[PDB]
Write a structure and sequence with these properties.
Modified residues (Cysteine sulfenic acid (-SOH)) (chain B): 108, 207
Protein name (chain B): KillerRed
CATH architecture of chain A: Beta Barrel
CATH class of chain A: Mainly Beta
Distance between the termini of chain A: 35 Å
Family (chain B): Belongs to the GFP family.
Keywords (chain B): Chromophore, Luminescence, Photoprotein
CATH superfamily of chain A: Green fluorescent protein
Structural class of chain A: mainly beta
Helix content of chain A: under 10%
Order of helices and strands of chain A: EEEHEEEEEEEE
Strand order of the largest sheet of chain A: 1-2-3-11-10-7-8-9-4-5-6
Largest sheet of chain A: 11 strands, mixed, barrel
Oligomer: homodimer
Pfam families (chain B): GFP
Number of domains of chain A: 1
Strand content of chain A: over 45%
Number of helices of chain A: 1
Chain lengths: 220, 220
């Protein structure tokens, strides 16, 4: 069902410290997956915050799993799946988001509402002072009969060669009402990287991401 | 990195849980090249007044197997040694704050720990000792200034009834020397652990072994 090149559209309806902003983005994922790109544009004009922190908002299902481990994100289709995420930033604001993933034959469509409250006007976030997104080892845990929980440490290198840590916490619920196999505790490596377009007179950002799952056996 | 030979270690934990004191002394040895070793700990004050699981991280960053390429801060810290400041917040349960001190005595490293365990839930799986497994995880290492490393991890505990208790691990490793040490870039250290009661022993004596090895992930 994900055995072929695919496409996706992201519609993000968000707000930051009361100020609204919206973003549309889309991209493709060659097969196999776990290495794809996205092109997102802030339709409200210049994004009112560093793009960095939104990297995780603009495709679990496009991460290449090995055989042993089950790809919950994909199994969820066609009935799609929901996502309740949270990311608390150390000494700055936090961003709650709700995700909606609808499949469209070859194109998967997600709708997202994201709140970004309590952000520091002088923090490296509001001041666009984040330069890097540190690669990290995501933590995947079973969660009820139908869910899967994803905990992560997203770090962004600041301008002073400092480090901004985000505490990532995301619940992925399968929409269907049918028996789906939940997988055992594992991890998913996420290496991302975004980039200025320079073509559009508009705030348009390109972000690549490579993601692949893996296990580590218990002591027998 | 004069950890070329084998080592031994003595741990003296001076702790307390929701106001009730308790003390632990442990010792063990690490065969070269380390990253697979055992500790044997016993609760001198008698029966540990809480699950042993949560105190698995108390009973050695330096006995982890690092590959060539990543600086081994923990070992670099010697012979003068290092101290650790750490917090582990447990979901729906209490949190434990500990201060660590490490020094190398010949070929045997000794450490003393103080640890407050507060707000722990009497009816929880920690106080009612219902934790079963220690989920293997990928702890996150970060550079933290000129003479310290930061460690972040998700420590998950299986509950008897197939549930999950999550611990939010946050550890700072400060170098005590008055030299200039080499701080490593963001990397990871895999940590599998297993506990086992030494029944032959009449005291509250639990044995623990863990294998810990580091690695990194290239950027794009």
């Amino acid at each position: 069902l994900f055995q072929s090149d695919m496409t996706f559209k992201i519609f993000i309806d968000g707000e930051v410290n009361g100020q609204k902003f919206t973003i549309v983005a889309d991209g493709s994922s060659k097969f196999p997956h776990g290495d794809f790109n996205v092109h997102a544009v802030c339709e409200t004009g210049k994004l009112p915050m560093s793009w960095k922190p939104i990297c995780h908002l603009i495709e679990p299902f496009f991460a290449r799993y090995p055989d042993g481990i089950s790809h919950f994100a994909q199994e969820c289709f066609p009935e799609g799946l929901s996502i309740d995420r949270t990311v608390r930033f150390e000494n700055d604001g936090t961003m709650t988001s709700h995700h909606t993933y609808e499949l469209d034959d070859t194109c998967v469509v997600s709708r997202i509402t994201v709140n970004c409250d309590g952000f520091q006007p002088d923090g490296p976030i509001m001041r666009d002072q984040l330069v890097d997104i540190l690669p990290n080892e995501t933590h995947m845990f079973p969660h009820g009969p139908n869910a899967v929980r994803q905990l992560a440490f997203i770090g962004f290198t600041t301008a002073d060669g400092g480090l901004m840590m985000g505490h990532f916490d995301s619940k992925m619920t399968f929409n269907g009402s049918r028996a789906i196999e939940i997988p055992g505790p594992h991890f998913v490596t996420i290496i991302t990287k975004q980039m200025r377009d320079t073509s559009d007179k508009r705030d348009h950002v390109c972000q690549r991401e490579v993601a692949y799952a893996h296990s580590v056996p218990r002591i027998t």
